[PDB]
Amino acid sequence: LPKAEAKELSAFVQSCVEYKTNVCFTDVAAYESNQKGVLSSGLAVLVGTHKQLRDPAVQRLPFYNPAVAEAIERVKEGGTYGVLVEGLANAAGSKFVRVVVGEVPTKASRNNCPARPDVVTALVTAALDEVKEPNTTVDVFVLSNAVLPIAAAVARCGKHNFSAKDGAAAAAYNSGKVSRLQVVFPEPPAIPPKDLEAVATSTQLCQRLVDAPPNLLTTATFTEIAQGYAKALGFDVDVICGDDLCERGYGGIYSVGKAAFEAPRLVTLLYTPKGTPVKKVSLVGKGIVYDCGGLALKPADYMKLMKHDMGGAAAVFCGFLTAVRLQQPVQLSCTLCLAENAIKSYRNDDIIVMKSGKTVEVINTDAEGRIVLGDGVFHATNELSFTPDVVIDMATLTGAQGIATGRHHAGLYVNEEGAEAAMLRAGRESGETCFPVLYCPEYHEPEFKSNHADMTNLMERRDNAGVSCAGYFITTHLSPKFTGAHIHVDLAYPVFNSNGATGFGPALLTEYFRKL
Amino acid sequence: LPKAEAKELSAFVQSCVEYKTNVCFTDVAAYESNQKGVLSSGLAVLVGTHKQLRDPAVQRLPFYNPAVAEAIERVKEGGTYGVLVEGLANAAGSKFVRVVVGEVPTKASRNNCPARPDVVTALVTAALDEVKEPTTVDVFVLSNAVLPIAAAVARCGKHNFSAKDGAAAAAYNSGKVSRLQVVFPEPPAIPPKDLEAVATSTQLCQRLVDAPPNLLTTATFTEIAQGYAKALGFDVDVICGDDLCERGYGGIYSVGKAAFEAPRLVTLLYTPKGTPVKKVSLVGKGIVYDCGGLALKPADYMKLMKHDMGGAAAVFCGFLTAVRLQQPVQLSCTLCLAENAISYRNDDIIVMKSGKTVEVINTDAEGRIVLGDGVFHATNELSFTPDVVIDMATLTGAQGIATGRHHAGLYVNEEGAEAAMLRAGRESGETCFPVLYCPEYHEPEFKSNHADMTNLMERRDNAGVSCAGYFITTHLSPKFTGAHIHVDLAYPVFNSNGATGFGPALLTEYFRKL
Amino acid sequence: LPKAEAKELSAFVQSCVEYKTNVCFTDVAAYESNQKGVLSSGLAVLVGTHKQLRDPAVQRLPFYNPAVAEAIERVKEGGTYGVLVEGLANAAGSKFVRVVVGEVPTKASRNNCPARPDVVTALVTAALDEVKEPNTTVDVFVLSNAVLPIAAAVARCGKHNFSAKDGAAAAAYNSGKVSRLQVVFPEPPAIPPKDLEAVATSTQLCQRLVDAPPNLLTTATFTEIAQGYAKALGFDVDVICGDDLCERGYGGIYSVGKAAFEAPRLVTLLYTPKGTPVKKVSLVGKGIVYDCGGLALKPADYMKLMKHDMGGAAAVFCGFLTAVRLQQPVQLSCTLCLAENAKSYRNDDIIVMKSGKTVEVINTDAEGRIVLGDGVFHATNELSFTPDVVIDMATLTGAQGIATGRHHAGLYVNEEGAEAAMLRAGRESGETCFPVLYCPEYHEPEFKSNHADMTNLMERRDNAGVSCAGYFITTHLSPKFTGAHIHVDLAYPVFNSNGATGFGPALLTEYFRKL
Amino acid sequence: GGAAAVFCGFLTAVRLQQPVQLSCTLCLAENAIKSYRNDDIIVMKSGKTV
Numbered sequence A: 001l002p003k004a005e006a007k008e009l010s011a012f013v014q015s016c017v018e019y020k021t022n023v024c025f026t027d028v029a030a031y032e033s034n035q036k037g038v039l040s041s042g043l044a045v046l047v048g049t050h051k052q053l054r055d056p057a058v059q060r061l062p063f064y065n066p067a068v069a070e071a072i073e074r075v076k077e078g079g080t081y082g083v084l085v086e087g088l089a090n091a092a093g094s095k096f097v098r099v100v101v102g103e104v105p106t107k108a109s110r111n112n113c114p115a116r117p118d119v120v121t122a123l124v125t126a127a128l129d130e131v132k133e134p135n136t137t138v139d140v141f142v143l144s145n146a147v148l149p150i151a152a153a154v155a156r157c158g159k160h161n162f163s164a165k166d167g168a169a170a171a172a173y174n175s176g177k178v179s180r181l182q183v184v185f186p187e188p189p190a191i192p193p194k195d196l197e198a199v200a201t202s203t204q205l206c207q208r209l210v211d212a213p214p215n216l217l218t219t220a221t222f223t224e225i226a227q228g229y230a231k232a233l234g235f236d237v238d239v240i241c242g243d244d245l246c247e248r249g250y251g252g253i254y255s256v257g258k259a260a261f262e263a264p265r266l267v268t269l270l271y272t273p274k275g276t277p278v279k280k281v282s283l284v285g286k287g288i289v290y291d292c293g294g295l296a297l298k299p300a301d302y303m304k305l306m307k308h309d310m311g312g313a314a315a316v317f318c319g320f321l322t323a324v325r326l327q328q329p330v331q332l333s334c335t336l337c338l339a340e341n342a343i344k345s346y347r348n349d350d351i352i353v354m355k356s357g358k359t360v361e362v363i364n365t366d367a368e369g370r371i372v373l374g375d376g377v378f379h380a381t382n383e384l385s386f387t388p389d390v391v392i393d394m395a396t397l398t399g400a401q402g403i404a405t406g407r408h409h410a411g412l413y414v415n416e417e418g419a420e421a422a423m424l425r426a427g428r429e430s431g432e433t434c435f436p437v438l439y440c441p442e443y444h445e446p447e448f449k450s451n452h453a454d455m456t457n458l459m460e461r462r463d464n465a466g467v468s469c470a471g472y473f474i475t476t477h478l479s480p481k482f483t484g485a486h487i488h489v490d491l492a493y494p495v496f497n498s499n500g501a502t503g504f505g506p507a508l509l510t511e512y513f514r515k516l
Numbered sequence B: 001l002p003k004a005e006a007k008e009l010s011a012f013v014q015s016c017v018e019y020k021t022n023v024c025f026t027d028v029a030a031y032e033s034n035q036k037g038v039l040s041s042g043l044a045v046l047v048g049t050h051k052q053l054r055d056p057a058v059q060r061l062p063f064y065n066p067a068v069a070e071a072i073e074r075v076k077e078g079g080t081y082g083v084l085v086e087g088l089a090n091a092a093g094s095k096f097v098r099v100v101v102g103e104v105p106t107k108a109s110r111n112n113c114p115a116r117p118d119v120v121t122a123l124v125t126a127a128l129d130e131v132k133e134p135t136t137v138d139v140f141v142l143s144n145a146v147l148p149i150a151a152a153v154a155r156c157g158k159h160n161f162s163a164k165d166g167a168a169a170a171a172y173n174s175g176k177v178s179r180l181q182v183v184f185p186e187p188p189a190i191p192p193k194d195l196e197a198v199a200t201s202t203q204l205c206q207r208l209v210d211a212p213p214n215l216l217t218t219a220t221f222t223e224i225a226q227g228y229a230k231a232l233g234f235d236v237d238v239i240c241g242d243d244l245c246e247r248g249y250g251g252i253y254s255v256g257k258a259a260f261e262a263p264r265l266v267t268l269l270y271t272p273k274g275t276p277v278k279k280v281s282l283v284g285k286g287i288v289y290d291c292g293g294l295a296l297k298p299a300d301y302m303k304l305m306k307h308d309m310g311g312a313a314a315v316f317c318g319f320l321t322a323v324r325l326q327q328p329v330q331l332s333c334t335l336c337l338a339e340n341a342i343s344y345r346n347d348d349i350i351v352m353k354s355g356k357t358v359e360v361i362n363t364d365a366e367g368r369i370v371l372g373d374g375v376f377h378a379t380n381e382l383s384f385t386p387d388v389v390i391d392m393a394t395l396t397g398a399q400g401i402a403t404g405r406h407h408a409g410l411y412v413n414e415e416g417a418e419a420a421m422l423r424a425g426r427e428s429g430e431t432c433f434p435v436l437y438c439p440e441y442h443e444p445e446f447k448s449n450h451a452d453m454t455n456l457m458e459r460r461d462n463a464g465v466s467c468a469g470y471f472i473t474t475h476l477s478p479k480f481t482g483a484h485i486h487v488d489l490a491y492p493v494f495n496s497n498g499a500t501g502f503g504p505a506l507l508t509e510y511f512r513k514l
Numbered sequence C: 001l002p003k004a005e006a007k008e009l010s011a012f013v014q015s016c017v018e019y020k021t022n023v024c025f026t027d028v029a030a031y032e033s034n035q036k037g038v039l040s041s042g043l044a045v046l047v048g049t050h051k052q053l054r055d056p057a058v059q060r061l062p063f064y065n066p067a068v069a070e071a072i073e074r075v076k077e078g079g080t081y082g083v084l085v086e087g088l089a090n091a092a093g094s095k096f097v098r099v100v101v102g103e104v105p106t107k108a109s110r111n112n113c114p115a116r117p118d119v120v121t122a123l124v125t126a127a128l129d130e131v132k133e134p135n136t137t138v139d140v141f142v143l144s145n146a147v148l149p150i151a152a153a154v155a156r157c158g159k160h161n162f163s164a165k166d167g168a169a170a171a172a173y174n175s176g177k178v179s180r181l182q183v184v185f186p187e188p189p190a191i192p193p194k195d196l197e198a199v200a201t202s203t204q205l206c207q208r209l210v211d212a213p214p215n216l217l218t219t220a221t222f223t224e225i226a227q228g229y230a231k232a233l234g235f236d237v238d239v240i241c242g243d244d245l246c247e248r249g250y251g252g253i254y255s256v257g258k259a260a261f262e263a264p265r266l267v268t269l270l271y272t273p274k275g276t277p278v279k280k281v282s283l284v285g286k287g288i289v290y291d292c293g294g295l296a297l298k299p300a301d302y303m304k305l306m307k308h309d310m311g312g313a314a315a316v317f318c319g320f321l322t323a324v325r326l327q328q329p330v331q332l333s334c335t336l337c338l339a340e341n342a343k344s345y346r347n348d349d350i351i352v353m354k355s356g357k358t359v360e361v362i363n364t365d366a367e368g369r370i371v372l373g374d375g376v377f378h379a380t381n382e383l384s385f386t387p388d389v390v391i392d393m394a395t396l397t398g399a400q401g402i403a404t405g406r407h408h409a410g411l412y413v414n415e416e417g418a419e420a421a422m423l424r425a426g427r428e429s430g431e432t433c434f435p436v437l438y439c440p441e442y443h444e445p446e447f448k449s450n451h452a453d454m455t456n457l458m459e460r461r462d463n464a465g466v467s468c469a470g471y472f473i474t475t476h477l478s479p480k481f482t483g484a485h486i487h488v489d490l491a492y493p494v495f496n497s498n499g500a501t502g503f504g505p506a507l508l509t510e511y512f513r514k515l
Numbered sequence D: 001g002g003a004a005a006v007f008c009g010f011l012t013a014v015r016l017q018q019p020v021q022l023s024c025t026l027c028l029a030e031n032a033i034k035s036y037r038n039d040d041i042i043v044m045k046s047g048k049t050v
């Protein structure tokens, strides 16, 4: 590459490797003792349910006055209402302090998170529009004690840490428009503040990785980022790259990424805790650049979904980091299936020899993301120093996921009922919600029928459980060594919203591991 | 209107009202006692799993010989293998007796019926190709799952509805359909007469859905409903034409006001003897020439339009089975019947019976509009208030993408009622799978500038099956606070050979466990 | 026609005929002397530019305090910033009064209104979201003196008077969510408050007509509404209806509307002022129900645009009403081309237009310009006078949005003088326009037909789409007519995300004022 | 085009008095008014169903 590009990519790698969260955590009493009632800046936020906002505990808060009381009355459900308070002592020394009240709904269905962190994100995002200075800290008083989903929700909200606006490209694409946020819980949090910072950091790193454009986050830079963390946090990293993938039988990931300027890479990270592990889990993530397609939606729609194609790789990677930082008692592998699908007719009707030994007929070159997951899955369940009890693969795979489970619920295709319930619980507890997709291999297998290969890479009929079939394809490349629960997570839509990446995935994994 | 057309419709109405099944049920012991070794015809079918076929009880069957044993060893999983038995005694007097062996798979997921009735149907269909004189064919099933097998055999082979080879003159009744005698290993847990009733309702549903829209119209459906009401002795209420407008049913009225035949809200009522175990209301979509959406291409919806009566046919035949078996459930069945015929009505704001207003941003999606009126009717205008409201419809193309060709999508507000219906699907073979229930996220998709709601979700890729179901739930009566079960059966209602008769058996099995 | 629908339609007709604006107008000095520092309710709005908000006069306003001064400092350009004032006197008896400051940008191009009423509407729309009770009066303090565009802008904003939400259907689709608005100018207004009320009423009446669905605003009901205003305001009405259109030679409008349940109608309204008219002007409006189509956009796009296809007829109708109410010195006719169109049917038909020229119908979707052909000939050949200017307004093409955008109506006009006049009317009224290419030499060949005088649609869509649609209409002008013809394509400016904008009437009003 | 060609060919045979016994059947109908009559089964004059 040119010297200017190489310098830029190195700077971007460093910004991801050294990324630290803007969010910190505390509780009302500690805040009272540490900050002596003085607000951090000229902006404060109060978020809670209709009931919680009227609790007497609110009246004892430092910023409370009759004006704030009226704001609580005038605010709409799922909306904000801002009021000024003159002569309220703050660190910035502002003559006024803006207090914004946000009402969270209590309505929540049996498939959602009761604390409704989706609305908490929206409320705080709206409130941060009234931020004055870029160097200030905003106190976010939350009236809920669900520390994990709120930690993720606040990490998710506001201006994104990734930005190319207003000369931020000269500062390694670190946004200067992000405000520091201090979340203040009522009670001391059940999960320690430092652990919550780690969760918040992973949500925002995941967001950065998915927001980053494909000319910054490439197969090479992602690999370098993974290697950077391995050195810093002290975990093992293994990289099977380029022609070595072909030599060693990884025909799927090789075939998909062989046309690119940068070689395809199967990067596997290993974490083994001190003492006896509670479970042995393997993570596999789809991280294919310029790769998004299918038959369920129009071609123009898949170009919009291509924007967030690293969502799977980012989710498993950041979930892995949190496990290492929290020192969770789980033996963990994380395999990043990284390739750049460069240069429609090319590779069409190719027959590839997968690492599993099974042959795949490429009937559609747009659907070359489940192929790399096939190699990733076999590698995890066959080629590692341990055999996992559970395999979790995450990928922004199908447009059918949106039609099936929607914008907020990732699709779960899983072989065992118990594993499904566990992950569903983790979604409701974390706020990164999921919903099951049809598991029935008898009806999925015939859709991949091939005249000359063992299978095709795409279902014949699009209207026959679209999410499920993509999941099934991946399961056919599981190793016979594996006898445990396979969880396929299709997160094509939950990985983003109108403002960009959401950092969906890592907190779901963190909560899943806590209950193992 | 013409005499020739009017006479044809009357003959078709009689064929559906007087429909009798071609299937009967018995067991191996009762079979040997009544027939004493003589087979009913020159064709016999043996269907079972790999283990079941090698059971010692198989070699003690009338038709068994060394050739049949070789069939059991040569047959492939999910395939058939035929052999002749020379000089075998049979009532038809055939020189040979063809024995077709079919192997059923044992593999079945936690969302599928363990007996795999889908393959049973496929096996028996392939075996009936070698029929000589379309004669009663003996089908020996090695499974004891009587209810799903009853439905499985009822839907297999040649369909009773036909317009081939001069069948139009004989009220579209097929002469190619062979009689079938299913022989279970042991005496069935459900009476043979009850199994026959389930088979009949499956085939009547098949007949109604197979029937083209120029035979099964809004008028002929109601006449068929009135026929069974007179025969079986149950009440029937019909709100027809402009009476729907005056009485506030703007949804179903607006949809069918353009048609030659008027729209009809046909409510049937069945109350059993004594205390009913539950009060259940059925609501079915029966709109003629009405199929559309945004998830699939326009050409795809034209193919799905052929089976638009599936929702109405499913609830109607399930109601009939409950009356014939005398199931202890207070039952109502509202048929939302209309013909969407003749840009028209685009951006119309109609006042629904619930009082809520609907902006028609898409005229193709008007199936959920009539269901809204039917749902409010069942939950507000009946003499009783139901505990469970079940609506069934061939509603969305998104259903196929979500749950597939074999599983009806379930959008239901209570977890208990969902698990019940899912169990009913696995027990009966007419399988289902749940679709996301989350009204918080479905409501914003129907936002409207001038009306209370639109009739179609703004974004196509945000739980399409769920949203279409949510719309219907907004028109539930405030009086109702029980379980609502929306069943999207757009795809399971048909296959390559036509209608499946999906729905009735699922309801029956659901009613049996209440 | 069932009795339920008949009663519904009659109730809707009355609601349009008897419509009264929620807005009234006054000024600071008059407001003080009549209300004495007691606000009308618990919400007040302050809308002005950065400079205007920092004018010394702002400190002297009744609601001003250091919290409001801070709101002026923190608010963003084009945004709002709300603050509570405790114990401020107000007639609603609210313990706190909410003051919402909104900043209007000064940036305005040579083709836009300097007052930026587009933002004013948005600011006041945002401010009204924080309303507690709907049955109150909100004081709206504007720091601008451009009274006409502000009047139209404020009439435009907030909840629409038409609604079918929450039982509004039982009250003739009159919204119960609309708040009364008292606009308070700095100086006494150059245009009388009652005249501004009339302009506001027309904007909102136009909004109601376009918002109204096609099952309520039909060809019969619009006609009944026009008749109702004729009786009340005292102007003449002529209605050529049904088979009479065919017999009298109006083959265009007849062919388009003959298939429908309700018959097509050519409604013409005449207004003659007292004394010498400054100009004789004829208005023509497209009001075709279920009719929207073309080749420039996808079929799905035209279905969305179809919701506002009464915008042309509504614009001219309400522009006519304002002329009658303000008694503007302009002899005025207003021809409403009304019909219901309800793809293969009538394709390749050759219809004999009222002008005598034959039209081949190559595309059945584009028959809005056909009804305008008859309307334009009627106005220029069949009336008791001969107009000096002919103005036709229609939501005609999707190309209009591609050409001139969502905020500027496309102008196709033969004389540069009448073009410049209408452009000035747009910039002054705020209902902006922009010229589309006038060049008949290059538009004529696109309508070449084998057997008719012309086709109804251009052969090549990428050859000035807005212009060619306008050219088609000019071919059916009477040979008697030798004046200026102004074709206004307002396909997009007639609506926004919230619904109808009521675009059109205020442009006509301001156009007449400078004749 | 089809009905016109057959009709005008007939007229030429009648005017020229060509030595061919000729019948001319014009299948005339106005197709109004896409979903309408979709999946209908019709009994043709031949007795076969379509």
Ligand SMILES: [Mn+2]
Binding pocket: A407, A497
């Ligand atoms: Mn969203």
Ligand SMILES: [Mn+2]
Binding pocket: A497, A498, A499
């Ligand atoms: Mn969004």
Ligand SMILES: [Mn+2]
Binding pocket: B405, B495
């Ligand atoms: Mn199938």
Ligand SMILES: [Mn+2]
Binding pocket: B495, B496
């Ligand atoms: Mn099939």
Ligand SMILES: [Mn+2]
Binding pocket: C406, C496, C497
């Ligand atoms: Mn806009």
Ligand code: NA
Binding pocket: A093, A094, A095, A096
């Ligand atoms: Na300050």
Ligand code: NA
Binding pocket: B384, B385
């Ligand atoms: Na009761």
